[PDB]
Structures are given as structure tokens and as C-alpha cells.
Amino acid sequence: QANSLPPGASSPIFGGSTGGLLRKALVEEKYLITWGSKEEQVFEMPTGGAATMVAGVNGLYLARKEQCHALHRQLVAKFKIRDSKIYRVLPNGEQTLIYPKDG
Amino acid sequence: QANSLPPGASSPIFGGSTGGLLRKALVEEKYLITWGSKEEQVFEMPTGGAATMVAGVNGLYLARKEQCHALHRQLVAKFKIRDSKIYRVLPNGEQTLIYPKDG
Amino acid sequence: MNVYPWLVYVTTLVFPLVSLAALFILIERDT
Amino acid sequence: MNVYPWLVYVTTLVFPLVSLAALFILIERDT
Amino acid sequence: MNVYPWLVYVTTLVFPLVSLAALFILIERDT
Amino acid sequence: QWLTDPTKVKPIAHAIFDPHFGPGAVKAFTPEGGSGPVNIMYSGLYYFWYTIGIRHNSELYEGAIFLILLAALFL
Amino acid sequence: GMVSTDDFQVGTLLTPVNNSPFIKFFINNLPINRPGLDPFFRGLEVGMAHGYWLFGPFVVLGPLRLTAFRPPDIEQLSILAALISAIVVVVAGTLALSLYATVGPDDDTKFGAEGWSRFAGGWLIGGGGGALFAALLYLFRGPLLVMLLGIIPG
Amino acid sequence: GMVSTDDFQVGTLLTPVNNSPFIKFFINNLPINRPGLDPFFRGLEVGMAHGYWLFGPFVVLGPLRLTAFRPPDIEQLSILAALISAIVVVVAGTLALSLYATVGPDDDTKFGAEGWSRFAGGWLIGGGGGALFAALLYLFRGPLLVMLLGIIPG
Amino acid sequence: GMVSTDDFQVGTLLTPVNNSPFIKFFINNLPINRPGLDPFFRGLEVGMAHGYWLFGPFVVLGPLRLTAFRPPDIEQLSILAALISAIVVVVAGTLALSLYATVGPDDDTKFGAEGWSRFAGGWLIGGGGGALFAALLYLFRGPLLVMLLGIIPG
Amino acid sequence: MLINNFEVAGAFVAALIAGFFALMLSTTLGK
Amino acid sequence: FMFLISWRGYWQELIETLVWAHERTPLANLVRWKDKPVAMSIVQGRLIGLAHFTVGYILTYAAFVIASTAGLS
Numbered sequence: 013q014a015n016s017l018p019p020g021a022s023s024p025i026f027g028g029s030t031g032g033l034l035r036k037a038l039v040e041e042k043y044l045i046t047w048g049s050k051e052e053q054v055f056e057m058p059t060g061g062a063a064t065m066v067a068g069v070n071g072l073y074l075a076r077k078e079q080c081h082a083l084h085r086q087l088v089a090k091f092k093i094r095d096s097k098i099y100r101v102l103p104n105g106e107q108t109l110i111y112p113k114d115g
Numbered sequence: 116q117a118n119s120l121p122p123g124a125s126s127p128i129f130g131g132s133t134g135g136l137l138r139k140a141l142v143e144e145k146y147l148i149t150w151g152s153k154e155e156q157v158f159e160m161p162t163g164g165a166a167t168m169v170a171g172v173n174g175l176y177l178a179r180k181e182q183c184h185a186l187h188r189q190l191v192a193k194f195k196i197r198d199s200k201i202y203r204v205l206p207n208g209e210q211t212l213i214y215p216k217d218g
Numbered sequence: 219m220n221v222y223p224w225l226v227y228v229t230t231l232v233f234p235l236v237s238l239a240a241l242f243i244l245i246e247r248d249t
Numbered sequence: 250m251n252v253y254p255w256l257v258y259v260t261t262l263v264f265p266l267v268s269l270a271a272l273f274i275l276i277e278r279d280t
Numbered sequence: 281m282n283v284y285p286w287l288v289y290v291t292t293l294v295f296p297l298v299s300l301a302a303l304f305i306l307i308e309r310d311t
Numbered sequence: 312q313w314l315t316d317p318t319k320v321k322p323i324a325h326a327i328f329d330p331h332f333g334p335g336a337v338k339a340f341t342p343e344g345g346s347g348p349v350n351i352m353y354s355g356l357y358y359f360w361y362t363i364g365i366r367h368n369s370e371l372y373e374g375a376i377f378l379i380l381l382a383a384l385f386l
Numbered sequence: 387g388m389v390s391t392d393d394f395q396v397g398t399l400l401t402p403v404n405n406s407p408f409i410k411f412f413i414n415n416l417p418i419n420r421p422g423l424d425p426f427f428r429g430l431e432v433g434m435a436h437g438y439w440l441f442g443p444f445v446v447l448g449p450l451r452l453t454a455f456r457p458p459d460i461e462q463l464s465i466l467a468a469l470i471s472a473i474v475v476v477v478a479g480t481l482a483l484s485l486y487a488t489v490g491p492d493d494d495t496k497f498g499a500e501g502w503s504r505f506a507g508g509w510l511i512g513g514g515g516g517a518l519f520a521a522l523l524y525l526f527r528g529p530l531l532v533m534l535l536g537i538i539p540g
Numbered sequence: 541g542m543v544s545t546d547d548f549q550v551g552t553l554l555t556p557v558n559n560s561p562f563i564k565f566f567i568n569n570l571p572i573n574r575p576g577l578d579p580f581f582r583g584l585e586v587g588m589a590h591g592y593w594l595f596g597p598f599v600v601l602g603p604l605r606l607t608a609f610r611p612p613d614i615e616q617l618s619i620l621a622a623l624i625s626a627i628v629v630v631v632a633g634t635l636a637l638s639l640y641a642t643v644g645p646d647d648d649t650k651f652g653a654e655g656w657s658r659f660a661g662g663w664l665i666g667g668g669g670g671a672l673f674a675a676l677l678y679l680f681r682g683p684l685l686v687m688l689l690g691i692i693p694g
Numbered sequence: 695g696m697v698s699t700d701d702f703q704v705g706t707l708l709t710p711v712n713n714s715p716f717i718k719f720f721i722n723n724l725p726i727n728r729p730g731l732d733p734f735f736r737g738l739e740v741g742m743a744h745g746y747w748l749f750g751p752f753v754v755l756g757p758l759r760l761t762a763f764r765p766p767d768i769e770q771l772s773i774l775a776a777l778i779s780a781i782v783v784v785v786a787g788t789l790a791l792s793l794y795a796t797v798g799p800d801d802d803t804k805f806g807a808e809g810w811s812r813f814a815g816g817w818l819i820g821g822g823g824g825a826l827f828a829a830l831l832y833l834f835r836g837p838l839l840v841m842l843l844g845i846i847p848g
Numbered sequence: 849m850l851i852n853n854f855e856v857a858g859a860f861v862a863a864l865i866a867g868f869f870a871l872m873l874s875t876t877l878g879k
Numbered sequence: 880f881m882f883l884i885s886w887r888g889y890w891q892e893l894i895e896t897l898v899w900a901h902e903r904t905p906l907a908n909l910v911r912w913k914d915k916p917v918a919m920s921i922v923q924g925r926l927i928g929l930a931h932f933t934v935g936y937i938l939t940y941a942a943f944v945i946a947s948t949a950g951l952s
């Protein structure tokens with residue numbers, strides 16, 4: 013609904029925490045990390061807890077870009093996944109690429 | 116104004132009663148009977164009282180379909196008029212025929 | 219002494235100001 | 250005596266009318 | 281004694297809360 | 312008080328707080344030696360509680376506690 | 387001539403109870419029909435009239451009224467009882483008005499649910515104020531209905 | 541320097557009575573001009589200030605005031621009379637404000653007729669409340685203007 | 695089953711404290727969330743509940759309370775002081791709401807600045823009235839908490 | 849000897865447990 | 880000594896839990912801050928600790944040096 017994924021990305025299985033999005037994600041900005049995994053495996057959330065991601069393309073909305081870039085260094089340092097791309101989602105629905113800005 | 120006849124039908128001479136229309140005719144539905152008389156003749160109202168129909172096509176607005184049907188059967192049983200057409204009138208002004216359906 | 223004082227309060231004090239307010243409505247509202 | 254009469258006022262007079270108002274809200278609002 | 285107690289109530293209790301509300305309006309309203 | 316004389320003093324159901332009573336009804340539903348208006352019990356519960364061996368208001372109180380918690384268990 | 391009907395199919399009779407022009411000026415400038423009023427003010431004025439008269443039957447006819455009671459120490463209890471009685475009747479009317487408002491009104495007023503809730507709020511404040519104002523004038527009707535200046539000295 | 545005009549056809553002068561920035565901060569944040577306020581609350585705050593000070597001249601200067609009358613037996617009559625006097629002056633102001641509203645206002649407020657009726661309503665409740673509040677603090681000025689704790693025992 | 699989230703990214707949990715239907719009925723029909731209500735009536739009902747309970751701690755616990763004080767002549771000063779205390783606490787809450795309103799709110803209510811000023815106004819009148827109504831029932835708790843008819847004669 | 853207010857308060861604590869369980873049962877019967 | 884010993888990031892994380900508690904409390908998330916609650920800054924934590932240390936120092940010694948000398952008799 014208010015946190016809809018782009019088409020092609022499927023949600024990882026997470027049971028919901030209290031450390032996630034707050035009212036800023038509705039009114040100022042939120043962020044989206046989108047990566048590609050070869051299997052289903054278990055990763056620590058940057059906001060607390062653990063989640064399971066599936067094979068294919070996985071997207072996650074976070075309040076904060078350092079939460080996304082901390083998730084990205086976790087995927088590199090544990091699961092060798094380097095195709096995370098980080099978007100800044102505005103509340104009107106605009107999406108801009110902010111990592112990799114080089115490509 | 117709010118209760119306007121179709122063009123071609125003239126109002127019968129009635130001094131208006133208290134058995135007639137209520138707020139439902141403003142807000143939900145009302146019903147309209149049009150008949151053809153050859154002369155000016157005196158008929159009982161279904162809502163109480165007596166009225167006089169003039170020569171020509173007479174239209175009358177009633178709250179229920181049974182009031183219109185009882186008026187039509189009284190016109191058959193006393194004054195031999197069998198071309199009454201009973202319509203259902205919505206509050207927006209859309210008109211549909213409900214008696215006779217067959218023709 | 220036979221007096222109705224509340225009636226003096228009604229029609230000498232309350233009712234004239236009532237009447238001037240009603241006449242103000244009569245002379246200052248269009249249609 | 251050993252009476253809590255404020256409780257009699259609450260649960261025999263106030264709380265029934267409270268309850269009928271709440272049930273009126275239950276039976277008269279669309280969804 | 282030679283005291284104005286109402287003045288103590290104004291300038292030590294009412295007027296500082298007045299002043300903090302006025303500075304709240306000064307520091308929070310945009311333009 | 313009813314165990315000391317079961318044949319004279321009448322069983323009492325509960326006491327009355329109705330603000331509509333005048334003075335005649337306040338003294339009418341008050342017994343002799345009582346400090347206010349009560350209902351005289353006509354259901355035989357004192358005779359029940361005597362025959363099943365309740366002798367104190369504290370046993371009646373623990374019966375009340377046990378039935379409230381047994382109701383709480385059934386809900 | 388006097389019993390006209392203008393819309394003869396609408397079940398109405400335009401009669402001099404209905405169609406006298408001072409009666410139309412009275413009813414159409416009663417607060418609920420008076421043009422240019424927000425529904426809160428209409429509720430406030432309806433409340434003040436109602437809460438002012440509602441004090442009276444409770445203080446003359448209620449359970450504390452008589453000359454055979456205990457001095458006029460009981461009369462303060464009578465005025466207080468009638469005051470609380472009229473405010474709780476206004477509270478019940480407010481509850482009625484806002485149970486009407488909260489369920490979604492469909493009526494000849496152009497009020498919404500929010501407009502009828504404004505009327506309910508004005509009704510409550512006006513009715514409790516009218517009860518309080520009738521209680522204060524009934525604390526004052528001893529000196530009000532005599533020449534109080536005249537029996538006091540100096 | 542101090543007196544400019546900034547539209548010299550318009551018959552006004554821009555003067556340090558007119559155009560000093562704290563005077564504009566004061567006047568522009570008096571409740572009739574303070575931004576973000578519904579007209580009812582503007583009326584409410586205007587009423588509370590006015591009805592609070594309106595109790596005073598009636599209690600100090602009215603027909604029941606002196607030290608040569610009957611004890612402080614007349615003092616409760618003085619407080620009640622001044623209370624009723626300030627509420628009826630607020631009622632006359634309400635009548636004035638709502639006769640202004642109901643005949644259709646044209647003014648530099650963006651109030652409607654409905655907005656001025658909200659102002660009239662808030663004026664009445666705030667004014668009678670300010671009268672009642674000034675009466676209660678006038679009843680309390682004995683213990684308020686002394687150290688009350690200290691003469692009472694225990 | 696009991697702890698779900700719907701939106702797993704938003705930092706919240708759907709829990710029996712949150713998501714059972716009677717708490718959602720209670721909270722969604724507490725006045726600030728009750729549908730079809732103008733903000734003024736919402737603040738009025740919130741004020742009346744609050745100002746009614748706010749009288750209590752000031753009259754039982756305040757500086758004028760004891761049985762070791764001077765008759766129940768100090769009891770009327772206690773009720774009057776507690777009444778003024780609850781009204782000034784409501785005034786401070788009104789100041790809080792209207793300073794929230796006048797700087798321009800961004801919040802999940804769809805009130806404007808004007809809506810929160812309607813809430814502030816309703817809060818003030820309802821709170822002072824709840825204080826006054828709790829004071830009147832506290833004055834009347836003598837005859838309320840006994841059968842008054844019965845000790846009195848005639 | 850009758851029952852004092854502390855044991856009536858204990859009975860009200862027990863009735864609050866019963867009232868909570870009744871309030872849960874009535875709402876899940878309402879589903 | 881609280882501002883002097885305990886420093887910033889504790890209080891910032893604590894205020895983040897308080898921010899979550901306010902935005903998920905019904906009847907109260909409808910009241911919003913205009914300025915975001917953060918912890919006080921590092922220099923501000925030192926300064927508020929110094930100001931309290933200093934105010935307490937001066938009032939403690941002023942109370943002593945007046946009442947011990949006035950209570951000689």
C-alpha cells in the first residue's frame with residue numbers, strides 16, 4: 013500500500029519489528045535497498061532481529077541510508093552479494109538512485 | 116418545481132391534501148400515473164378527498180405504486196379508463212416505465 | 219402592596235431590548 | 250450501613266445509560 | 281505588612297508563564 | 312446474629328440504598344436493632360448455609376471469593 | 387383563500403398556522419432556522435433557553451421544596467439539587483444530540499455529522515449555563531423582586 | 541524617517557504607533573488577529589479577558605458596596621449582583637455580535653456570518669466564564685492575599 | 695498468530711493490546727478518533743472528563759484538607775480552592791493546545807490550526823465545566839451518599 | 849462481625865479478574 | 880555529574896526509543912513535535928553539567944557560610 017515494492021522485487025520473509033519505519037518515511041523520505049540472492053538464507057536486520065530472504069530479487073524499505081549501507085556491507089562481508097542498489101523514495105512516489113551513482 | 120409533470124400532461128384540479136407525498140419522494144423514490152380522460156369528471160383520491168380530472172392527459176404523483184394501481188383500478192371500475200401508465204420516478208429525474216411492461 | 223416586579227423587569231427592561239433587536243433584524247437584513 | 254452508594258449510582262443509573270448509548274452506536278452505524 | 285501580594289502573583293507566577301508562551305510563539309512560528 | 316436465635320430474628324438478604332425512600336419507608340424496612348433499611352430474605356439461604364455447616368461470615372466471604380474465581384476459570 | 391396548498395401532490399396544506407408571515411418570521415428566525423448562524427451558536431442559544439427554563443420545575447416541584455422542611459437551610463439544597471438536575475437533563479440531551487450526530491444524520495438541515503456535533507456542544511454549554519444563570523437569578527430573586535435598596539441602612 | 545505612508549493615496553500614516561514591530565506583534569497576535577485560530581476561539585479569549593475585568597466596577601462601585609451596610613452579609617449579595625451584572629453585559633455584547641452576524645457582515649475579517657456567530661458564541665461563554673472566574677477569585681481574595689497557612693491551626 | 699505486522703517494514707506490531715476489536719472500538723470511539731465529530735465537541739468531551747477528575751486530588755490532598763483544621767468552615771474554602779486549581783490546570787492545558795495550534799500543526803488528525811484551536815476552546819469550556827460540575831457534586835455528596843429523605847422532617 | 853472494606857476490595861480484585869475474562873469471552877464470541 | 884559522566888549516544892538512543900513510544904501511543908501520536916527530539920550536543924552536555932556543578936557549588940557554600948555564621952549565637 014504505502015510501502016509498495018517495485019515490480020520484479022519480492023519481499024523477504026520478516027515478522028515485523030519495532031525498529032523499522034517511523035512517520036518520517038510517510039512525510040519526508042524513506043529508502044529502499046534492492047539486491048539479488050541466489051538462494052534463500054538468513055540475514056540480520058539492521059533494525060533488530062533476523063529475516064529470511066528468497067532466491068531472486070529482494071527489496072527492503074528502511075528509514076535511513078546508513079541502515080541500507082550497513083545491510084549492504086553485511087551482504088558483502090557474509091554472503092558475497094554486491095548488486096545492492098539503494099534508492100531514495102520521496103512521499104509522492106519518486107525514486108532516484110543514490111548508490112551506485114557511478115554505475 | 117420539485118414535482119414537475121412531463122410535457123403534454125396537465126394537472127388535475129385538486130386543492131391538495133395531507134395524505135400525499137412525504138420526504139421519501141424527495142429522497143428515495145416516487146411514482147407517477149398518467150391517464151387519458153375524454154371529459155372533466157370527479158374521482159376519489161387514493162390519499163383521501165375528491166378531485167376533478169380535466170379532458171386530456173392527467174398526471175398525478177403518489178408515494179407508492181399501490182396508490183397508483185388502486186387509482187387505476189378505480190378508473191377502470193367506475194369511469195372506463197384503461198390507458199393509465201404508471202412510472203417510477205427517481206430523485207435525479209430519470210424516468211422508467213413499470214406498468215404495463217408488456218405494452 | 220400588590221406588585222408583580224418580575225413583570226416590570228420583563229416588559230420595561232427585557233422586552234424593549236428584545237423589540238429593538240427584532241426591529242434591527244427587520245431593518246438590516248436583505249430579503 | 251455497609252453500603253457503597255456511589256457504586257449504586259454508577260452501576261444502576263449511569264452505566265446502564267452508558268451501555269444503551271454504546272449499544273445505540275453499535276446498532277446504528279454503517280461499518 | 282507593606283506588601284502587594286497580587287503583584288507577587290502577577291510578576292512571579294502569571295507573567296513568567298505569559299513570557300514563556302510569548303517566547304514559544306517567537307521561536308516556533310515561521311514568518 | 313441469626314445463629315444465636317434461629318426462631319425469632321428473620322433472615323436478611325441485603326441492604327437497601329434507594330434515594331427515593333421517605334422517612335416512613337426508611338423506618339419500615341429497618342428491623343429492630345438495625346442501623347438502616349434491608350430486605351428480609353425469603354429464599355431459605357440461611358437454612359441452606361446452616362445445614363451445610365457455614366457458621367461465619369468469613370466462610371461466606373471465602374465462598375464468595377471461590378465462586379468469583381471459579382466463574383473466572385469458566386470464562 | 388387561507389387554505390392553499392402550493393404543491394398539491396406533496397401532502398401539505400398552507401394554512402395561517404403555516405403561512406402567516408409573522409409566524410414564518412418567528413420560526414425562520416428561531417436559532418436552528420435563523421440564517422447566517424454557525425450550528426454551534428444555534429445550539430448555544432437553544433441550550434440557554436432550555437437550560438434556563440429547566441431549572442424551575444426541579445426547584446418548585448422536586449423532592450426538596452416545602453415550607454414544612456428545615457429552615458431555609460434546605461432551600462440551598464433545593465437550588466443545588468435543581469441546578470444539578472437541569473445540568474444532567476442537558477447532558478442527556480447532549481448525549482441524544484451526539485448519538486444523532488455520530489451515526490450520520492440525514493435531515494433538512496444542511497449540517498453534517500460535524501454540524502450536529504457543534505450543535506450538541508453548544509447545546510450542552512448553553513444548557514448548563516442557562517441552568518446556572520437561572521440558579522443565580524434564583525439566588526438573587528429575594529433582592530430582585532423587592533426594593534432591596536431601602537431596607538438596608540446607610 | 542519615523543512617519544512614512546507606503547501608499548500615499550490611502551489616507552493613513554505609517555508611524556511608530558502604527559508600524560513599530562512589537563506593536564505589530566502585539567496587535568497581530570491579539571486573538572482576533574492571531575493566525576491559525578478559528579473565530580470561536582478568538583471570541584472565547586476576547587470574552588474571558590473582558591468578562592474577567594467586567595466584574596470589578598460592579599463589585600467595587602455598584603449599589604451594594606460599602607462599609608456602612610450590614611456586616612459582610614451584603615458582600616455575598618455584592619459578589620452575586622456584580623456577577624449577574626457582568627454576565628448580562630456579556631449577553632448584551634453577544635446580542636450585539638450576533639445581530640452583527642445575522643444581517644450579513646462586510647469587513648476585513650474573513651469571518652462569514654457563520655464566523656461572526658462563532659465569535660459571538662465564544663464571546664458569550666468566555667465572558668460569562670470570565671465573570672464567574674473573577675467572582676471565584678474575588679471570593680478567594682481573603683486567603684489569596686494573605687499567607688492563609690499560618691493563621692489556621694494544626 | 696496473535697503478533698502480526700501487516701506492513702513488516704513500519705516499526706510497529708499488531709498485538710492484542712493493539713489489534714483486538716474492543717480496544718479498537720474504544721480508542722476509535724474515544725472523542726479524538728470518534729467519527730463524525732467536529733474538533734470543538736471532541737475537545738469539549740475530553741475537557742469534561744478531565745476537568746471532572748482534576749477536582750479530586752486538589753480537594754482531598756491539597757493544603758486545605760484535614761480533620762484537624764477549623765470546623766467544616768475550611769471545607770468550603772477547600773472546595774473553592776480545588777475548583778480554582780482544576781480550572782487553572784485546564785487553562786494551562788488550553789494554553790498548551792493553543793500554542794500547539796497557533797504555530798501550525800502537522801499531525802495525523804485532519805485538524806488544521808483552526809481545528810486544534812476549536813479543540814483548545816472546547817477543552818477549556820469542558821474542563822472548567824467539569825471542574826465546576828465535580829465541585830457541585832462534591833458539595834452535594836452529603837445528600838447524595840445517604841438517603842436524604844428520612845432524616846429531614848415533614 | 850461483618851466484612852470490612854479491605855476484603856471487599858479483595859473481592860473486587862477477584863471480580864476484576866472475572867470481568868476481564870468475561871470481556872475477553874464476549875468479544876471472541878462476537879467474532 | 881549526570882551530564883559530566885554520562886555522555887551523548889546513550890541519551891540519543893534512549894530518545895529514539897522515546898520517539899518510537901510517542902509515535903505508537905494512541906491519543907498521543909496525534910500530538911506532534913515541531914522540533915525533533917534529539918540528545919543534547921557534546922559541548923552542550925559539558926556546559927549543562929558545568930552549569931549545574933557551578934550553581935550547586937555556589938548555593939551549597941553560600942547556604943553554609945551564611946547559616947553557620949548566623950547560627951553561632
Ligand code: CLA
Binds near residue numbers: 254256257325379856
Ligand atoms: C451477579 C450477581 C449480583 C447482583 C444481582 C448484585 C446486586 C446488587 N449489588 Mg452486588 N456484587 C456482586 C454481585 C451482584 N450484585 C459481586 C460478585 C460483588 C463482589 C465484587 C458485588 C459487590 C457489590 C458492592 C460493594 C455493592 C453491591 C451492591 C448491589 C446492589 C446495587 C447495585 C450495585 O451498584 O452494585 C455494583 C456491583 C459491582 C460493581 C460488581 C458486581 C460484579 C458482578 C459479578 C457483575 C454481574 C454480571 C452478571 C453476572 C452478568 C449478567 C448479565 C445480564 C444482565 C444479561 C444490588 C442489589 C451495593 C449494595 O450493597 O446495595 C445497598 C454495594 O455497595 N455489590
Ligand code: CLA
Binds near residue numbers: 440447448449450475
Ligand atoms: C405525568 C404525570 C406526572 C407528573 C405531572 C409528575 C410530577 C412530579 N413528579 Mg412524578 N412520577 C410519575 C408521573 C408524574 N409525575 C410516574 C409515572 C412515576 C414512576 C412511578 C413518577 C415517579 C416520581 C418520583 C420518584 C418523584 C416524582 C416527583 C415529581 C415532582 C417533580 C419532578 C420533576 O420536576 O420533574 C421535571 C419536569 C421537567 C423537566 C419538565 C416538565 C414538563 C414541562 C413543564 C412541559 C412544558 C410544556 C409546555 C407548557 C408546552 C410547550 C410550550 C411552547 C409551545 C411555548 C412533580 C410534581 C418527585 C417528587 O418529589 O414528588 C413531589 C420525585 O422524587 N415522580
Ligand code: CLA
Binds near residue numbers: 290677
Ligand atoms: C471602574 C473601573 C474598575 C474597578 C472599580 C475595578 C476593580 C477591581 N479590579 Mg479591575 N480592571 C479595570 C477596571 C476596574 N477594576 C480595567 C479597565 C482593566 C483592564 C482591562 C482591569 C483589569 C483587572 C485585572 C487583570 C484584575 C482586576 C482586578 C480588580 C479587583 C481588585 C481588588 C481586589 O479585590 O484585590 C484582589 C486581587 C486579586 C484577586 C488579584 C490576584 C492575582 C491575580 C489573579 C494574578 C493574575 C492577574 C493578571 C494581571 C491577569 C492575567 C493576565 C493575562 C494576560 C494572563 C477589583 C474588584 C483583579 C480581579 O479581577 O480579582 C478577581 C484582577 O486580577 N482588574
Ligand code: CLA
Binds near residue numbers: 597598603604
Ligand atoms: C460618566 C459618568 C458616570 C460615571 C463615572 C458613573 C459611575 C457610577 N455610577 Mg452612574 N449614571 C450616570 C453617569 C455616571 N455614572 C448617568 C448619566 C446616569 C443616568 C441618570 C447614571 C445613573 C446611575 C444609576 C441608577 C446608578 C449609577 C451607579 C454608578 C456606580 C457604578 C455603576 C457601574 O458599575 O457601571 C459599570 C462600569 C463598567 C461596565 C465599566 C466602566 C468603564 C471602564 C472602567 C472604562 C475603561 C477604559 C480603559 C481604562 C481604557 C482602555 C484601556 C486599554 C487601552 C488597555 C459608578 C461609580 C450605581 C450606584 O450604585 O451609584 C454609586 C447606580 O445604581 N449611575
Ligand code: CLA
Binds near residue numbers: 748752755758783
Ligand atoms: C511525585 C512525588 C510527589 C507526590 C505524590 C506529591 C503529592 C502531593 N503534593 Mg507535592 N511536591 C513534590 C512532589 C510530590 N508531591 C516536589 C518534587 C515538590 C517541589 C519541592 C513538591 C512541592 C509541594 C508543595 C508546595 C505542595 C505539595 C502538595 C502535595 C499534595 C497535593 C498536590 C496536588 O493535588 O497536586 C495535583 C494532582 C494532579 C493534578 C493529578 C495527580 C496525578 C494523577 C492522579 C495521575 C493519574 C494517572 C492514572 C492513575 C493512570 C492513567 C489511567 C488511565 C490509563 C485510565 C499531594 C499529596 C501540597 C500540600 O498541601 O501537601 C500536602 C502543597 O502545597 N507539593
Ligand code: CLA
Binds near residue numbers: 744787897
Ligand atoms: C532535547 C530537549 C527537548 C527540548 C528543548 C524540547 C522542546 C520542546 N518540545 Mg519536546 N520532546 C523531547 C525533548 C525536547 N523537547 C523528548 C525526549 C520527547 C519524547 C520523544 C519530546 C516530545 C515532544 C512532543 C510531542 C511535543 C514536544 C513539544 C516541544 C516544545 C514545547 C514544550 C512543551 O510541550 O512543554 C511540555 C511540559 C512538560 C514535559 C512538563 C510536564 C509537566 C506536567 C505534565 C504537569 C503540567 C501540568 C499541566 C496543566 C498538565 C496537567 C493536565 C494533564 C494531566 C492532562 C518545545 C520547544 C511540543 C511542540 O512541538 O509544540 C507545538 C509537542 O507537541 N516535545
Ligand SMILES: CC1=C(/C=C/C(C)=C/C=C/C(C)=C/C=C/C=C(C)/C=C/C=C(C)/C=C/C2=C(C)C(=O)CCC2(C)C)C(C)(C)CCC1=O
Binds near residue numbers: 861873875
Ligand atoms: C485492582 C485494584 C482495585 C480494583 C479496582 C476494580 C477496577 C475493581 C473491579 C470493579 C469491577 C467493576 C469488576 C467487574 C466485575 C464485572 C464482572 C464480573 C462481569 C461479568 C460479565 C459477564 C459474565 C457476562 C456475560 C456475557 C457474555 C459472556 C456474552 O457473550 C454476551 C452477553 C454477556 C455480556 C451478558 C481495588 C482498588 C479494589 C483494590 C486494589 C487494586 O489493586
Ligand SMILES: CC1=C(/C=C/C(C)=C/C=C/C(C)=C/C=C/C=C(C)/C=C/C=C(C)/C=C/C2=C(C)CCCC2(C)C)C(C)(C)CCC1
Binds near residue numbers: 592673823826
Ligand atoms: C496592553 C498592555 C497593557 C495592559 C494590559 C491590560 C489591559 C491588562 C490586563 C488584563 C486582563 C483583563 C486580564 C484578564 C484575564 C483573564 C482570565 C485569566 C480569565 C478567565 C477565565 C476563565 C478561566 C473562565 C472559565 C469558565 C468558562 C469559560 C466556562 C465555564 C465557566 C468557567 C468559570 C469555568 C500594559 C500597558 C499594562 C502592558 C503592555 C500590554
Ligand SMILES: CC1=C(/C=C/C(C)=C/C=CC(/C)=C/C=C/C=C(C)/C=C/C=C(C)/C=C/C2=C(C)CCCC2(C)C)C(C)(C)CCC1
Binds near residue numbers: 435439514669
Ligand atoms: C412563543 C412565544 C411566547 C412564549 C415564549 C416563551 C415560551 C417564553 C419564554 C422564555 C424563556 C425560556 C426564556 C429564556 C431565557 C434565557 C436566558 C436569558 C439564558 C441564559 C443564559 C446564560 C447567560 C448562561 C451563561 C453561561 C454560559 C453559557 C457558560 C458559563 C456559565 C454561564 C452561566 C456564565 C409567547 C406566546 C408568550 C409570546 C410570543 C412568542
Ligand SMILES: CC1=C(/C=C/C(C)=C/C=CC(/C)=C/C=C/C=C(C)/C=C/C=C(C)/C=C/C2=C(C)CCCC2(C)C)C(C)(C)CCC1
Binds near residue numbers: 511743824826
Ligand atoms: C478505560 C476504562 C476504564 C477506566 C475509566 C475511567 C478512567 C474512568 C473514568 C471516569 C471519568 C473521568 C469520568 C468523568 C466525567 C465527567 C462528567 C460527567 C463531566 C461533566 C461535566 C459537565 C456537565 C459540565 C458542564 C458545564 C459546562 C461545560 C459549561 C458551564 C459550566 C457547567 C458546569 C454547567 C476501566 C478500566 C475502569 C473500565 C474500562 C474502560
Ligand SMILES: CC1=C(/C=C/C(C)=C\C=C\C(C)=C\C=C\C=C(C)\C=C\C=C(C)/C=C/C2=C(C)CCCC2(C)C)C(C)(C)CCC1
Binds near residue numbers: 373374375378
Ligand atoms: C462455595 C459455595 C458454594 C459452591 C460450591 C461449589 C460449586 C463447589 C465446591 C467445592 C469444594 C469446596 C471442594 C472441594 C474439595 C476438596 C478435596 C477434593 C480434597 C482433598 C484432599 C485430599 C488430601 C485428597 C487426597 C486424596 C487424593 C489425592 C485422591 C483421592 C484419595 C485421597 C484421599 C488419597 C455453595 C453455592 C454450595 C454455597 C456457598 C458457597
Ligand SMILES: CC(C)=CCC/C(C)=C\CC/C(C)=C\CC/C(C)=C/CC1=C(C)C(=O)c2ccccc2C1=O
Binds near residue numbers: 881883
Ligand atoms: C524552548 C524550551 C527550552 C522549552 C523547554 C523544554 C522542556 C519541556 C524541558 C527542558 C528539557 C529537559 C528537562 C531535558 C532535555 C535535555 C536532554 C536531552 C537530556 C538528556 C541528556 C543527558 C541526561 C546527559 O547527561 C547528556 C550528556 C552529554 C550529552 C548529551 C546528554 C543528553 O542529551
